[PDB]
Design a protein around this ligand. Structure first.
Ligand code: 2OH
Ligand code: 2OH
Lengths: 227, 227
């Protein structure tokens, strides 16, 4: 009852912080903000792919299934990260230590409604006192449970889901005896994450079509996935 | 260990079957199909409002909170119903006993992608052997967990969520000892339901804007909710 090994493992597999590095020579605009954010996402996607390899059983899936899970889950993983980084803040989203968006900035970027939904995720997790252990486990569950239409080995993916769910259940049983239903409460946060991700993918797909915001190869690869 | 009372109660509160009654004098078209479906939804929404009153604690919320939960959850409740009605069928959606859509009909109605996602929900629940007891409990959880941005009494809504989650957990502990993680598996089906609902609301909102498909008052009320 030092806690669950999978949880411990995900904690040490957690990537280091990444800076956004908005270009200080460029005038502030919606284009600058969206460019900065998509550039940051592209770099994060590299680290997310590397991170996934540490999840027990993930690297044993076919390359096609690994890619399918990542192409369905990437936005949820990105959003859960900004959510977690923002828990100790008030009405602000910490995309990076050097890129914190308040309401005015979100409006300027055309992201008021989307960032408000992300702040809704933040609000609920603040009330629940979301722990880092729970965050990393939920990121892994979101990956495994992402509902790609293209899975080859359905049973192996369900097995991965079960392994990660078990880890969450075991963690909560040991760490949160005061609330025997806390694991389920955690799982019940996933629908809002999925809802927000679905809308964010459509939003940025539309930005891609408009062609005014430069996007890098990996971000585009994820955005152009069939979902 | 005759099972959970809330589950038993939801089972007897289950509304009776409703027929679609497509107009046999009208030529088949996309407009006919969509008209028929939205008409059916309108009638179902009446029965769903009545049904919600049977859920322990729901009628004790403010009228505003009851409406907020229903306006966020209605599409999920409707979709979970067609999903459940379709479990014993193959690649067909049983909107009603007299309205069963196959792939060609979905294409004709402009609903291929949406109905395919609903069939994805069906596929997963068939594999899990979803029971009526679990269906009705999930409908109630979807209502309570619908993530409206407009809730007045956040704590009372979280209490309702907990009561219903407890019922699911208790049901599974008694009925499914072979799988100590089945309740969580059930909760993990909710993200796809939310994803599909989010897309369906947008789809039918766009049909509303186009103005070619007649819609009744209650369906419109739900569709025009701020979400
Ligand atoms: C994908 C997006 C550019 C992003 C970038 C980086 C990040 O850490 C999280 C999310 C994003 C999505 C939704 C949103 O409202 C703002 C930004
Ligand atoms: C809301 C909709 C008209 C409906 C009507 C009735 C129903 O039982 C379930 C869903 C609907 C949603 C999504 C969809 O693909 C088809 C029909």
């Amino acid at each position: 009852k030092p806690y669950n090994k999978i949880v411990s493992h995900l904690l040490v597999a957690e990537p280091e912080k990444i800076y956004a590095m908005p270009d200080p020579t460029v005038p502030d605009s919606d284009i600058k903000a969206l460019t900065t954010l998509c550039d940051l996402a592209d770099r994060e996607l590299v680290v997310i792919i590397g991170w996934a390899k540490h999840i027990p059983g993930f690297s044993t899936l076919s390359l096609a299934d690994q890619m399918s899970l990542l192409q369905s889950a990437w936005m949820e993983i990105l959003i859960l990260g900004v959510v977690y980084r923002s828990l100790s803040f008030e009405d602000e989203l910490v995309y990076a230590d050097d890129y914190i968006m308040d309401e005015d900035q979100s409006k300027l970027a055309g992201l008021l409604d989307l960032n408000n939904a992300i702040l809704q995720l933040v609000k609920k997790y603040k009330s629940m006192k979301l722990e880092k252990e729970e965050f990393v486990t939920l990121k892994a569950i979101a990956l495994a449970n992402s509902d790609s239409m293209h899975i080859e080995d359905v049973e192996a993916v369900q097995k991965l889901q079960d392994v990660l769910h078990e880890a969450l259940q075991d963690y909560e049983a040991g760490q949160h005896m005061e609330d025997p239903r806390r694991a389920g409460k955690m799982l019940m946060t996933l629908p809002l994450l999925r809802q927000t991700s679905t809308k964010a993918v459509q939003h940025f797909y539309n930005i891609k079509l408009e062609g005014k915001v430069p996007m890098h190869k990996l971000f585009l690869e994820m955005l152009e996935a069939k979902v």
